[PDB]
Each structure stands twice: as structure tokens, then as C-alpha cells.
Amino acid sequence: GPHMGNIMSASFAPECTDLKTKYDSCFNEWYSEKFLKGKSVENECSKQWYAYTTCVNAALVKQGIKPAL
Ligand SMILES: [Co+2]
């Protein structure tokens, strides 16, 4: 069934939770279309992936646990 989100990650970067939900949903929809239905479709979710990933990276850098440059 559905695999829940990470509580520690959400607690560390709550401002990224909605972006994560949107990315996970996009990816699941894409995977269903291509690998469950076997339909040759465009790659998807690059934008949703970027939004979430950048949000997480920004949080790590802001808290001083990831270098900026
Ligand atoms: Co499952």
C-alpha cells in the first residue's frame, strides 16, 4: 500500500512538506503510466523533483550542515 512520509525530515524542513507530497504523487502517477500500464510516455516530474530537492538543500545550508559553495 502507500508508504508514509518521513517524520524527521518533515520536522527538519516543514516548509518542504507540500513540495514532497506533490513530487511523490507525480512520480507515482508517472510510474503507474509507464511501468504498470506499460505505456511509452515522456519522462515526468522534473520540476516537482527540483522544487523539493532545492527546498531540502536550502534547509540544510541554512542550518549550517551543508556547505553553500
Ligand atoms: Co505498497
Author numbering: -2 to 66
Which of the paper's sentences describe this entry?
Although full-length Mdm35 (86 residues) failed to crystallize, Mdm35ΔC5 lacking the C-terminal five residues grew crystals suitable for structural analyses. The crystal structure of Mdm35ΔC5 was thus determined from its seleno-methionine (SeMet)-labelled protein crystal by the multiwavelength anomalous dispersion method using the anomalous signal of selenium atoms and was subsequently refined to 1.45-Å resolution against the data set from the native crystal. Mdm35 possesses a twin CX9C motif, which is indicative of the substrate for the Tim40/MIA import pathway. Mdm35 contains a short α-helix (α0) and two long α-helices (α1 and α2), which form an antiparallel α-hairpin that is covalently paired by two disulfide bridges, Cys13–Cys52 and Cys23–Cys42.
Surprisingly, two distinct polypeptides of Ups1 and Mdm35 form a single compact domain, the Ups1 part of which corresponds to the START (StAR-related lipid-transfer) domain, likely functioning as a lipid-binding domain. Like other START domain-containing proteins, the Ups1–Mdm35 complex contains a deep pocket that can accommodate a lipid molecule and an Ω-loop likely functioning as a lid for the pocket.
